[PDB]
Amino acid sequence: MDKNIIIGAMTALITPFKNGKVDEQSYARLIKRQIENGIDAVVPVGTTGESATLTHEEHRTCIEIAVETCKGTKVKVLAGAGSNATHEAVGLAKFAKEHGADGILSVAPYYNKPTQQGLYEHYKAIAQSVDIPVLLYNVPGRTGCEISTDTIIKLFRDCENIYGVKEASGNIDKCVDLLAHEPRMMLISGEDAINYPILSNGGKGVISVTSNLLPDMISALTHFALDENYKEAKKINDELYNINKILFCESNPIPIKTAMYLAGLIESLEFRLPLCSPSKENFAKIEEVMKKYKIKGF
């Protein structure tokens, strides 16, 4: 077999805005900070990057910046490129490739609730359209559908490029199911609070929200775990629980961008509708939780 893979400590990059546009210099600065704090790959325009409200041109711009910023380093770019329309997801995958992405993260179709057969055909079309690695992304709370274990495994076996899945499903039983039946895949944590449990069961990385704020801590947790230093990895996972939970007190990326702004890491607490600022109470909750953590500057 021997598929090409992108694994390790990875970050679902927030997308900073200034005056309604992507702040490209801030975006670059944030990526450099991830690289300097032990991150192995970055994910431009994932859910956390507000992919839904960026234009396709902004999609390109963000991917190009990530690629340029990672040159001269080992850090890879796993570009968000996914859609609930298969023709669009295919086109997005090819564009990501054309724009220098090392691999793609492709979310399960949201809203239109395809069957498992439909999911198989969707991802097969996507994988056949490019020659770079493809990571599936299961997040049923947002999409309204679940890629089943059987479908994930069938895709992994049938399509050379498809090498694993980012799970954001709060279902450790499924994580056991996946790796028990197909130990060759890369299971990637899409849920910060349970990064350590997923890694300790043989998961091989994380695509993290929390790492935007605490890249050094997420990187350490991940690399301790990858080395079977489980006591060390669990210690950081336990320490991170409070922040990992508060970062979801309202829908991601509302709390993470709020945190980045509070920390002085971005200049404006600005979103695109229908996302908006958190409630005053949640703003204050996030602020208090942060005080317990050492937040790396630039």
Next chain:
Amino acid sequence: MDKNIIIGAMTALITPFKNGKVDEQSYARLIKRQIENGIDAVVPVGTTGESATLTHEEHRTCIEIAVETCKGTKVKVLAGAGSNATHEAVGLAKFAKEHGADGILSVAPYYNKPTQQGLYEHYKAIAQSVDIPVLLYNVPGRTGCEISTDTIIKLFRDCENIYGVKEASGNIDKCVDLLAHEPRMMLISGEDAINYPILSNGGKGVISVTSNLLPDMISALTHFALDENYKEAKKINDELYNINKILFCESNPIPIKTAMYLAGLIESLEFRLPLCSPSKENFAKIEEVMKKYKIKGF
């Protein structure tokens, strides 16, 4: 207060394909069939019409065909125009108006899970962009979010054009809450099996899947209920239960397009990925359930 409204028996039109393109002649012929069977409005490019996978040029085509076909008739066009990006939902509402729609149906943002404040701001922007009726559309099983009762009522009260909500949420308690607190709105059933309970509680129409296949029966049900002939409305609702439920044995519009094909009302059983044909077992179930109903031809 005296809002412009679009109510009564309405159909979420399927979109027929032929060789990967919208079958334009067939779409017109299906709409004419709805008109001739007592339907009060049609909804081009809703969920049932595969809005997700149609291009923006195709949305335009479908809306224009609906508008042309209903011209010279009492039938209104409530065009699907909705997005999880507020800038895009505004654009699409303006476009729908420009192509002659009488009103728009605007789905709650899917996938990105805005907060109630976000939803308020989203819909306020959409309502402010046009001068035609706007019906909200709540379908949490597909979007991952819920427009709360309070948000819906605030939108109804604050925004001239917003006149009610299509509820597809299996939640009769919420239907009670909505009409007990704001009896002036138009609550529309987006769930065929429970059309009668929604209407008998003061709901004022349906946006129906089943009516694609059985337009005369849905329109009769609806009109009886609006005339307070609950006995006759319930009789048809009970008779329709079997078909109403089998049309969701797989994600809509997979079963309804299967039925339309079986009835000889569309030429090709064809979807756009990630949607695809049903399993052999479900196909057979749909075929058998159909036998109990009289299906109108052209």
Next chain:
Amino acid sequence: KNIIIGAMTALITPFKNGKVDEQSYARLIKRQIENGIDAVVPVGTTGESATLTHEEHRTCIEIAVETCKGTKVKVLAGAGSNATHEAVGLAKFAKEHGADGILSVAPYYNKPTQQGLYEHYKAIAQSVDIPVLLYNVPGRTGCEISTDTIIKLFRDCENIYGVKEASGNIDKCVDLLAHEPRMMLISGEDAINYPILSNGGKGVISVTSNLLPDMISALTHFALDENYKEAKKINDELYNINKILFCESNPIPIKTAMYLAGLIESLEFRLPLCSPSKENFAKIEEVMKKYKIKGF
């Protein structure tokens, strides 16, 4: 069949110094009878069946039977268990104490399969000679009696005559009555009493009626007589109180309301139930002030 339908009340069970307040219980039942109620349910969920002893179960059923004697009002006794042998025994017990019928909750905790639920209820129904109403409340039991199982039991067992549904699932109510219109669908969810009745439901077993018996009976009887406009008007007026009565697990809010209304002297439960939070206490307090609460 032989049936018990109409407006019915899931009686709360008042405590004083950790004992069933037998005086109070009789008095509260009298108050239900005098406010248009068609039947009472001693020792249902609302009655804290879980924490009463078998002797107290007997006592409440006896007091209900006695208070309704000579009156039009029937007693549909709570008599259910997650052990079939015990549910059979409680059914016989209820009939012995002169109940007109029993309300029998789906087994909680042990999650029997549909085949198991059928055998459970078949065993009970074949054991006594009085009406049996199934009672489906998946949020509390961890299982659901499916439409197919409910219909099969109704068709197969002469004395099983319907189901109390507490499942927030109007689709299922349509399913049940479309496929088997002869059964008695009974609302176990006050906020949606009107939608269940308007689809051909034939009664309610109500929590709210403890506090507002006249309004719940009025609503029910208007709907049974097809005055939907008046039934809906009352269902709408009741929504706020109907919702606040579940702000914490029933019967915590209804006992709180009965206490605040001066209808019971003490706000006493049996553990593990206990008084509501301060925030919820106050909410209940304020919601009640929009309603006329009848005294004795």
Next chain:
Amino acid sequence: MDKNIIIGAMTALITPFKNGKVDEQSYARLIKRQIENGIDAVVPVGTTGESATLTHEEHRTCIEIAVETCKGTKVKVLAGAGSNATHEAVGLAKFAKEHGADGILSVAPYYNKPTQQGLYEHYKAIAQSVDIPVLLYNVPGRTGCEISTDTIIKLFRDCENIYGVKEASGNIDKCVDLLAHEPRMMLISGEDAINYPILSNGGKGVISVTSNLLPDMISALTHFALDENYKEAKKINDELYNINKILFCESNPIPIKTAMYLAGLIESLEFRLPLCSPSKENFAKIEEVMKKYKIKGF
């Protein structure tokens, strides 16, 4: 704080019937088989032991047999003693102590849905009634209520006897929460498929269904994990996934008793209503899954 504890590999004992009565000779023989296969504690009359349908005399009989069978060995008896009525749960706790149990497993109140405050007072009264260890048992899918992390932690800290919780909630996030905020407690897996993830996060034992059939494999999994031999523990957990899942194809203990019968370990496949035999379909599925496993006799 030096709490007394009962941890390690533990079995929720099935209760065999013969001619409608507890088969006492079979029960003793089944317990001896557990002891001889590396089990550290047995749980008579838990959920798996059909506590709901046993009479109180039968509870006494099962506890007495477990107690007697464990004499002369290190194996402990953690007796099921719980109820949804606090007065009865107190009574059962005392009765378990009197019949020689080393500790009690006490299920959250089912059916009546107590609030967090009610749960606190429930378990506080239970803990004050005896001087032996008390393990909480959270199983929301069966009880309709959840003991929150805050409540479990408050009980652990406030009540000398309460030493931990058996979690059967499919919620590894909550397992993280519990041990991150209160590392001194004994988190026990009540969900076989996820035994390894719970143990690798610092859980200290399992109360197992699967161990009825495969006590040596569950014992080895547990002891490898407790020694931080995570590779070896995970390997068994993976191997066991298929049997762990099929043992819940119908409500436990229906599949486990079916497996014991198929294995020749009990003489009849007998339940007390409302429990009953599995479908013929599921009977066959269980039989097929077992073929892959080595099963020890007596």
